[PDB]
Design a protein around this ligand. Structure first.
Ligand SMILES: [Ca+2]
Ligand SMILES: [Ca+2]
Ligand SMILES: [Ca+2]
Lengths: 305, 9, 305, 305, 9, 9
């Protein structure tokens, strides 16, 4: 993996993070408070990094050499550099919302949220427990343990070939689609944390990639790195077409689905389905007249097989 | 935090 | 409309707003954090005004002359002056809760909430899009467009005569009741935003004023400019009378209804009905034993016609 | 009761509270923001004490001698001293989570939450209205009024003998169990506020102590001074055993129950039952397959009698 | 934010 | 504030 994490690199990273903070306090950006909110995320990430350092008082050599922590720190440093490049190389299109540069800052925001979530899953309370992480579906737990043991983080290639023995991937293009879905921190590493998220979202394990095919790859309602405010904004054009709906990953309850939909009374509501898989929510909502037109489209996929 | 409401009626 | 908005007037307004802030940090007031909270509202309003100015860097002449923005700024300035008068001309009855002066500060609070909401609807992201605002019910959309085109804001008189051609108003007293309901920012102007709120609340459009007659004008459960904390406080006297209920506009989800009710287990709960109009919620809740005694009264209106 | 409350003692108390605040800002502790959060609680308690003092401007002699306020201030001072002792006499086991010292700081946190809640119930808006407090169940209201009149706070002994005439307590050990449940502020005084909480939780009044026997004393799912984050953490080991459940008092909606449960899709969800007593929620959840194994145990109590 | 709970049972 | 969700399905 990347290099060992010393004090010099943590104090560089914070200085990068504080630069992204200053950039992001531009009033022309019109940043709204809702998650994911980069103005809370960077400060919160520093705080959890303070926590880790504090509990590794003495044992810095152990922490500095930890594999996950080295990959994490590199991801964090790379992403905060991408955000600084994005502002600089975007000059004034950062301010026109629905410019590409601006969509790119929202996507980073989400990535900064997914990274903080992963770091807290792996280091709850500032201490490394990647090696005892609990994978939430038992079959998926068995897969990881048989393939990688108690490893916290594995390169994409090695993950893809392990997955491929049990759940065959059809092609190069399907594999790249798969990668973008799972690899929430976008760093070409698959964590036990990102694996947990993906197999909870696309359970049951016994048909994993067919489930991911129907709900994401071939479904017009699925929306990849979208936020709550983006879903609301996207549905506005269908305000007069009750039953229009889209769905995505929840950013604050990672592992759970969030469905957005236009009601018959002129509201745009967002829900998080409980005690039922997305399929069943989608089927029943169609049957009850709520989830009819995915992304405002007139046909809806028949998930009833 | 954002507004998530109960599943539809 | 009012005068053009220059730098001198924005820096006056902020100075007024900061005076209301200082007044409102009196510990004798016992202000609670819940929406609507004047201590978050004024600061937030400044922030969105910072945002607007920032995106009109250069084009101040365009912004300064915008019709809605001129009316807005006047409303904001008038209301912050009323609040300063209220403290000064209230001397020490501001501190006795359930004094009139104190109820008047709560009502202003709500007004400051409704204004901020209108300003964000009309200037989402700091840019003026009153002219493309989406009215949420299609019929109501047609009405506005046929009557006023793409105007953002119209004087009450002109609004009343337009409404009156399609939905006849019975009398002067009914017209004044109507005005107080719709005119959420209390400035004798009806925005496309306030119109949207009113027709979403009292839909369907085809019986608009009968709907507003049954649910507000003649219903003992309707409560005009009340907050969540006021509803809770008002229901306390009926704590031992399960089924007592009141309803009002939600301040944080403008356009939606919030029902307050005393349960059979000694709780006071507040709900926001979804995927059904207030009528249906009221009828079904009566039939299921939840919403029985409006404002603790023994008879309940029969909405089942 | 304890001594009269003067200025000297309030300025001592604040100085103690600010010491607990400094101790609690140690990054090694890894304190999470969720209620109960001692970093918001102490500051908030000071603020409500500022409020009280401010409305008793002049009448300090009246406030200083108020019975409830004297007992409160003593409780607040004793508990903030216990927390300072706990850090000092815990040296470095404060930092190992699931050390005893660390569990003890969580329990104090909860106590600091219960005290602030009691002080706001008795002094809503900074003014003493213990004497008109509304007890939420009518029978329980009658009991208090017949036994103690309009008293705000009564010593445990006197409370136990009053209760004992109407709802006989079986033994010394049952009485001590009863005391720990009711006495939320742990100070050997029972407030009208704590009484209200207990009789709302364990209603109906006509079988009070049998209800408390079945749901708390003999139930393996009941969890005494546990927080939301502790329930989530406790259920992790049962992540693969859907139907495992535990319940407790809600800390932010005192008087209401919060049930934690592992779903069939790999989630840990927490709910607050409404318009039904805990018994009925427990029975129906068992019958629908949600609440099966209390604390992960294979048998579940039959509450259906 | 204030507590809004699901419609009554 | 913590996440409390509607009673189970
Ligand atoms: Ca990754
Ligand atoms: Ca207006
Ligand atoms: Ca007590």
């Amino acid at each position: 993996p990347p290099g060992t994490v010393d004090k010099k690199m943590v104090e560089k990273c914070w200085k990068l993070m504080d630069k992204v903070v200053r950039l992001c306090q531009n009033p022309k950006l019109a940043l709204k408070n809702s998650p994911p909110y980069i103005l809370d995320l960077l400060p919160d990430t520093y705080q959890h990094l303070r926590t880790i350092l504090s509990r590794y008082e003495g044992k810095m050599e152990t922490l500095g050499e930890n594999e996950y922590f080295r990959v994490f720190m590199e991801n964090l440093m790379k992403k905060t550099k991408q955000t600084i490049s994005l502002f600089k190389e975007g000059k004034e299109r950062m301010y026109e919302e629905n410019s590409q540069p601006r969509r790119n800052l929202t996507k980073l925001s989400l990535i900064f949220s997914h990274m903080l979530a992963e770091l807290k899953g792996i280091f709850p309370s500032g201490l490394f427990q990647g090696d005892t992480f609990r994978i939430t579906k038992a079959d998926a737990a068995e897969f990881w343990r048989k393939a990688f043991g108690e490893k916290t983080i594995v390169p994409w290639k090695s993950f893809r070939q392990a997955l491929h023995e049990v759940h065959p991937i059809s092609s190069g293009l399907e594999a790249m689609a798969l990668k973008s879905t799972i690899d929430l921190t976008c760093n070409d590493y698959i964590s036990v944390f990102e694996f947990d998220i993906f197999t909870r979202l696309f359970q049951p394990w016994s048909s994993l990639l067919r489930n991911w095919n129907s709900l994401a790859v071939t479904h017009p309602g699925y929306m990849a790195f979208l936020t709550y405010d983006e879903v609301k904004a996207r549905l506005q054009k269908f305000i007069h077409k009750p039953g229009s709906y889209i769905f995505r990953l929840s950013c604050t309850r990672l592992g759970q689905w969030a469905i957005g939909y236009v009601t018959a009374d002129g509201n745009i509501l967002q829900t998080i389905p409980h005690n039922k898989p997305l399929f069943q929510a989608l089927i029943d909502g169609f049957r009850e007249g709520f989830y009819l037109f995915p992304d405002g489209r007139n046909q809806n996929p028949d998930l009833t097989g | 935090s954002d507004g998530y409401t109960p599943e539809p009626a």
